[PDB]
Amino acid sequence: EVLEEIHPQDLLALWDELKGEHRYVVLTLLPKAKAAEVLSHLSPEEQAEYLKTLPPWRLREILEELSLDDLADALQAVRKEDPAYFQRLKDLLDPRTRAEVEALARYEEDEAGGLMTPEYVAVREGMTVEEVLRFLRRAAPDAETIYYIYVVDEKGRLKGVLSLRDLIVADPRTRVAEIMNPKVVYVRTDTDQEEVARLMADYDFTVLPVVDEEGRLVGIVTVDDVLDVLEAEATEDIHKLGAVDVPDLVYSEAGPVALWLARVRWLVILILTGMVTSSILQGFESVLEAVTALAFYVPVLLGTGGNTGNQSATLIIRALATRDLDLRDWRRVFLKEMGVGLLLGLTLSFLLVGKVYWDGHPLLLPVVGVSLVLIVFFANLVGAMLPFLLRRLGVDPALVSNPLVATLSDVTGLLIYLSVARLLLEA
Amino acid sequence: ALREVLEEIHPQDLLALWDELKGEHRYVVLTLLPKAKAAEVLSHLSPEEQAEYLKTLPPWRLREILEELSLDDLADALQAVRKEDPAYFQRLKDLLDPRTRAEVEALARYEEDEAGGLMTPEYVAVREGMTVEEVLRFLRRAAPDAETIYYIYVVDEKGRLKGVLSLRDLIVADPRTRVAEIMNPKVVYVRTDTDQEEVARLMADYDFTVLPVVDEEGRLVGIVTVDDVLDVLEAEATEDIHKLGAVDVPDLVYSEAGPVALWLARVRWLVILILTGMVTSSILQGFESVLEAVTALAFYVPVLLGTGGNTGNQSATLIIRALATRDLDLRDWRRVFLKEMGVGLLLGLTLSFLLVGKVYWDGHPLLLPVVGVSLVLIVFFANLVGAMLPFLLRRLGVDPALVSNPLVATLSDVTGLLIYLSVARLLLE
Ligand SMILES: [Mg+2]
Ligand SMILES: [Mg+2]
Ligand SMILES: [Mg+2]
Ligand SMILES: [Mg+2]
Ligand SMILES: [Mg+2]
Ligand SMILES: [Mg+2]
Ligand SMILES: [Mg+2]
Ligand SMILES: [Mg+2]
Ligand SMILES: [Mg+2]
Ligand SMILES: [Mg+2]
Ligand SMILES: [Mg+2]
Ligand SMILES: [Mg+2]
Ligand SMILES: [Mg+2]
C-alpha cells in the first residue's frame, strides 16, 4: 500500500511532532534505504540515540544502505557520545567499508575530507565516450553521482572532468580527453568547510573533486551537503553576533544549565569592560556634581553610540564573510564610513538637541549636541574597523559581536561626552 | 595578445578581479571578452552594475551579450533596467528575437522573489507515450539549448505535470522499456507564487538539484536550479544579518553603495530608536528627586543598563534564528518563556556577584542591594523580553528578524531604568 508511497521527507517533517516509540518502529518498518535516509537527516543527537536503540540487524541494515560520508557523520556522533559502543557499533561493518569510513573520520569534520564521499566515478585517461558510458552503467549502482566523471592519470591524480551531459551528446567513438575539461577546479582535504561552499557556489558546480595532500583524487563533495554548510555557517555567524559562542547549539535541544554555560562567558567579559564605565563616571564627579543635567542624557547619548557602532560593524562583518570586502579595503571603508558618521551625527543631533531644549535645559544644549556628532562619529568608525582589525590579526570578525561593540561604545561615549563637558565648563 | 593570454582566463578569475578594476577597465573587458564569457560576467554582477553596462556598452556587444545569456538571467538584467530606466528597458527588448523576447515578457511578469521569479523555461519535457530509447534520442537533440538534462519532466496533452525522470535512470534502464515506467508521480513541485526562500527550503531538504514550477492549474512553465537557490540562501541569510543590526535594505551591497546610499539605509532605524530612547531623558528627570539624594547612584547606570541590553541581545538572537531555521514552533513560546525564565535568573545571579563586588570595592558600600538586586531584576526581565519579542512579532505577521539588536538595547534602556530607579525609590525611603 503506502509502505512504498511515503517519502523519507514526509516522515522527516512530521518527526517534530511524533512520539519517540512510534518514531522508533518507523525505523524498523520502512524499507532499508528509506530507514537510512531518515536517520540521515536527523540531529546528530537523535542519530546516536537510535543507533543505540535499534536492533543489531536493522542496525547493520542502516549502516549498509547509508552513504559513506553520511555514515562517518553518524558514527562520529556516537564516537563523541558513547565511545565504547562506538567501536562495537563499528564492528558490524565489513572490512572494505570500515576501512573506508575510518579514513573519513581522520579528516576534520569542518574541512573537505570531512565533507567528501569516496563513491565517486573516476575513469583512467584514454577511453572513449561509448566505453565511459558502459563503465558508468557498471559503476552507477554504488556511486553517489555519475553526473560528473573525473579523469585521473596513472598515479591517481586529477587530469580532467567530464559531464554526463557531454557523453550523451557526443559521438560514442570520440576520445574523452578531447571533450573533458583539463582545468579541474578542486579542493584539498584540509580545505575549509566554508572555503568549499564558496567554490561550489562560485563556479555553479554540483559536485567537487577533493584531492588528497598529494593531488590524488580521494573523494567528492555534493552541493546538497554544502547547503547544510552554508546554513550552519550563517547560523554560527548570527549566533556570534548576539554574543553566544556555541557554533553547534540548537535551542530546542539544549537545557538551562547548558544555555547558562553558553551565554555566561561573554556577559562576564563585557561587564568587566562595562565596569570601566563606573570608574570613568567617578573620575568626572566634579562635573557631575556642578551641572546635574549632564547625567540626565547619558542613556540616550551613550546608547545612540552603540546603535551606530552595531550597524557599521554589522554592515562590515558580513561584507567580509560574503567576501564583498577584503582586508585591503579598510583604508577606503574608513573614508566612506567616516563621511557617513558625520552625516549620521548631524541628523541625530538636530533631533536630540530638540529634546534637550524642550526638556528645559537650553544651556547644556551645545554640550549634548556637539557630543553626539562626536560619538556617532567614533562609534561608527569603531564598529567599522574592529572586524577589519581582527582579520589582520587572524581572528573571526564575528567575535566583533553587537554586544561587544555596544559595551565598547560606552567606555568611549562617556570619555567623549564628559571630557567635552569638563572642557566646556571652563569657559 | 588580448584575445589570447586572456582568452583562457576564467570569467570567475575575472569576477574575483572585478572590484580591483576601474569603472573604465571593467568596461573594455566587458566589451572585448568573447560574447560568451562577457555575459557570464554580467550574469553574477549586481542589478545596479548590470543596468549600468547594459546602457553604456555599445548596441552591438549589447545585442551579442543580451542574447548569449541564460533566460532567467536575461529577465533579471531586464528588470534591473526597468527600475532605473523604464524607457531603455523596452528599447532594449528590441535587440531580442521574437522567441527569446517571448519567454521574457512572460518571465518578468512574475515576482522577483517568487518561484516564477528565479525560474527558467529551458527545461526538457516529454510524454509518457515514450520509451527510454526516444527520451535519450530526444535529449540529444534538445540538450544544447537547455539548463539541465539530468532531470526530465513529463507533461500531458494540455501541459500539466505528471512525473520526473533522472538521467541516471535513463542510463541504467533498458532502452526498450516505457517512460511512464521509471518516472515518478510522487513529483514534488512548487507554485509560481511560492516564496523565494520557501523554494530554497525544499530544494535543501529533498537534496534536489532541480525543482519544477506550475501555475494554479498544475501545468509546467519552468524550473529552478540549486545554483540560483544557492545565492538566495545567502541573500535571505545575509539580509537577516543586516536586519539584526538595524540596517533595513533588501540586497544592500556595501562595496557599491556610497555615503548617501548607506545614510539612506541606516538613518531610518537610528531615528526610530533615538526618539524611543529619549524616553530615558524624561525618565531620568521624573526621577531627579531620587537621583539628587544619592550621588553614587548614577555612577553605575551604564553598567546596569548596557548589561541587560546585552543579555536581551543574546536571548533574542538564539530565538530569532531558532525561528528562521524552522527549529521553533510559533507554539513553543510558552516553553521558551518557562525555559529562559531560569537561565536569566541564573545569569542574573552570577553577574550580580561580580557587579556587587565592584559597587562595594568601588567605594560605595552605602547599600549594594540598590544596585546588585536591580541587576538581577534587569538581567531577568530583559532576557524574557528579547525572547518573547520575536515570538509576538511573528503571530502578528511580521518578520521577527526585525527585533534587531539595537532595538533590543534601546528598548532595554526604557525598561532598565524604570526597574533600577524604582529599586532606588524603595530602597532609599
Ligand atoms: Mg569555521
Ligand atoms: Mg564528516
Ligand atoms: Mg553562483
Ligand atoms: Mg549557468
Ligand atoms: Mg552527501
Ligand atoms: Mg565566520
Ligand atoms: Mg522575502
Ligand atoms: Mg529572477
Ligand atoms: Mg540537505
Ligand atoms: Mg542524500
Ligand atoms: Mg539558472
Ligand atoms: Mg528572513
Ligand atoms: Mg547600550
Structural domain count, chain A: 3
Cα A383 from Cα A400, distance rounded (Å):
8
B322 CB neighbours in chain A (<8 A) are 250-252
Contact at CB, B307 and A271, closer than 8 angstroms: yes
Phi and psi at B190, nearest 5°, equal: -145, 135
Answer yes or no: is B217 within a domain.
yes
Count of CB pairs separated by less than 8 Å, A with B = 344
Query: A128 and A236: one domain?
Result: yes
Q: Select from B284, B347, B350 the Cβ nearest to the Cβ of A296.
A: B284
Answer yes or no: is A346 within a domain.
yes
Answer yes or no: is A327 within a domain.
yes
A396 is in an annotated binding site: yes
When scoring B167, B232, B264, B321 by the number of chain A Cβ atoms within 10 A, the one with the most, hence best to mutate, is B321
A340 CB neighbours in chain B (<8 A) are 259, 262-263, 266
Residue pair A340/B259 in contact (Cβ under 8 Å)? The answer is yes
How far, in Å, from the CA of A71 to the mean position of ligand 9?
A: 15
Query: A79 and A141: one domain?
Result: no
How far, in Å, from the CA of B111 to the mean position of ligand 8?
A: 8
B370, B351, B248: which is closest to B309 by C-alpha?
B351
Q: Select from A228, A352, A406 the Cβ nearest to the Cβ of B306.
A: A406
Resolved by: X-ray
Query: A4 and A99: one domain?
Result: yes
A121 CB neighbours in chain B (<8 A) are none
CATH value at residue B172: 3.10.580.10
Q: H/E/C letters for each residue in chain A?
A: CCCCCCCHHHHHHHHHHCCHHHHHHHHHHCCHHHHHHHCCCCCHHHHHHHHHHCCHHHHHHHHHHCCHHHHHHHHHHHHHCCHHHHHHHCCCCCHHHHHHHHHHHCCCCCECCCCCECCEEEECCCCEHHHHHHHHHHHHHHCCEEEEEEEECCCCEEEEEEEHHHHHHCCCCCEHHHCCECCCCCEECCCEHHHHHHHHHHHCCCEEEEECCCCEEEEEEEHHHHHHHHHHHHHHHHHHHCCCCCCCCCCCCCCHHHHHHHHHHHHHHHHHHHHHHHHHHHHCHHHHHHCCHHHHCHHHHHHHHHHHHHHHHHHHHHHHHCCCCCHHHHHHHHHHHHHHHHHHHHHHHHHHHHHHHHHCCCCCHHHHHHHHHHHHHHHHHHHCCHHHHHHHHCCCHHHCCHHHHHHHHHHHHHHHHHHHHHHHHHC
Search chain A and give the residue with CA nearest B187: A7
Surrounding ion ligand 4 within 5 Å at CB are: A 204
Note the Cα B235 to chain centre separation in Å: 4
Work out the minimum CA distance from A84 to partner chain B, whole angstroms: 31
What are B19's three cell numbers?
572590484
Query: A87 and A195: one domain?
Result: no
Q: H/E/C letters for each residue in B173-184?
A: CCCCCECCCCCC
How far, in Å, from the CA of A35 to the mean position of ligand 11?
A: 33
Quickly count: other Cβ atoms within 10 Å of residue B276's Cβ. 17
Helices B47-56 and B25-32 cross at an angle (nearest 10°) of 70
Contact at CB, B358 and A278, closer than 8 angstroms: yes
Contact at CB, B314 and A5, closer than 8 angstroms: no
How far, in Å, from the CA of B404 to the mean position of ligand 9?
A: 29
How far, in Å, from the CA of A109 to the mean position of ligand 1?
A: 10
| Domain edge (last residue) among A107, A129, A144 | A107
B11, B4, B36: which is closest to B26 by C-alpha?
B11
What is residue B372's DSSP assignment? I
Contact at CB, A274 and B306, closer than 8 angstroms: yes
Q: Select from B246, B350, B354 the Cβ nearest to the Cβ of A310.
A: B246
Q: Select from A165, A252, A351 the Cβ nearest to the Cβ of B322.
A: A252
Query: A372 and A231: one domain?
Result: no
**In angstroms, how far is the first alpha carbon of chain A from the final one?**
91
Cα B169 from Cα B174, distance rounded (Å):
9
CATH value at residue B29: 1.25.60.10
| Domain edge (last residue) among B185, B218, B245 | B245
A257 CB neighbours in chain B (<8 A) are 346
When scoring B73, B148, B292, B314 by the number of chain A Cβ atoms within 10 A, the one with the most, hence best to mutate, is B314
Resolution value (Å, 1 decimal): 2.9
Cα dist from B330 to B198, B388, B397, whole Å: 17, 11, 11
Query: B133 and B221: one domain?
Result: yes
Query: A237 and A295: one domain?
Result: no
Question: Whose grid coordinates read 596513472?
Answer: A154
Search chain B and give the residue with CA nearest A262: B314
Contact at CB, A251 and B322, closer than 8 angstroms: yes
Work out the minimum CA distance from B406 to partner chain A, whole angstroms: 5
When scoring B244, B260, B329 by the number of chain A Cβ atoms within 10 A, the one with the most, hence best to mutate, is B244
Answer yes or no: is A396 within a domain.
yes
Answer yes or no: is A249 within a domain.
no
Q: H/E/C letters for each residue in B272-303?
A: HHHHHHCHHHHHHHCCHHHHCCCHHHHCCHHH
When scoring A40, A42, A259 by the number of chain B Cβ atoms within 10 A, the one with the most, hence best to mutate, is A259
What are A20's three cell numbers?
519517540
Residue pair A121/A210 in contact (Cβ under 8 Å)? The answer is no
Cα A317 from Cα A337, distance rounded (Å):
14
B363 CB neighbours in chain A (<8 A) are 282
Burial B24-34 (b: 16+ CB within 10 A, else e): eebeebbbebe
Query: A188 and A294: one domain?
Result: no
What are B58's three cell numbers?
555599445
| Domain edge (last residue) among A242, A269, A287 | A242
A380, A414, A407: which is closest to A266 by C-alpha?
A407
CATH value at residue B393: 1.10.357.20
Contact at CB, A296 and B285, closer than 8 angstroms: yes
Answer yes or no: is B250 within a domain.
no
Surrounding ion ligand 6 within 5 Å at CB are: A 398
Query: A124 and A94: one domain?
Result: no
What are B164's three cell numbers?
520526473
Q: By residue range, what is the domain housing residue B292?
A: 257-429
Query: A86 and A157: one domain?
Result: no
Query: A205 and A271: one domain?
Result: no
Answer yes or no: is B355 within a domain.
yes
- In which region does residue B207 sit, left (phi positive, over 0), alpha (psi from -120 to 50) or beta (all else)? left
- In which region does residue A131 sit, left (phi positive, over 0), alpha (psi from -120 to 50) or beta (all else)? alpha
Residue B151, SS3 per DSSP: strand
Answer yes or no: is B147 within a domain.
yes
Cα A421 from Cα A415, distance rounded (Å):
10
Beta bridge partners of B213: B190, B222
Query: B347 and B199: one domain?
Result: no
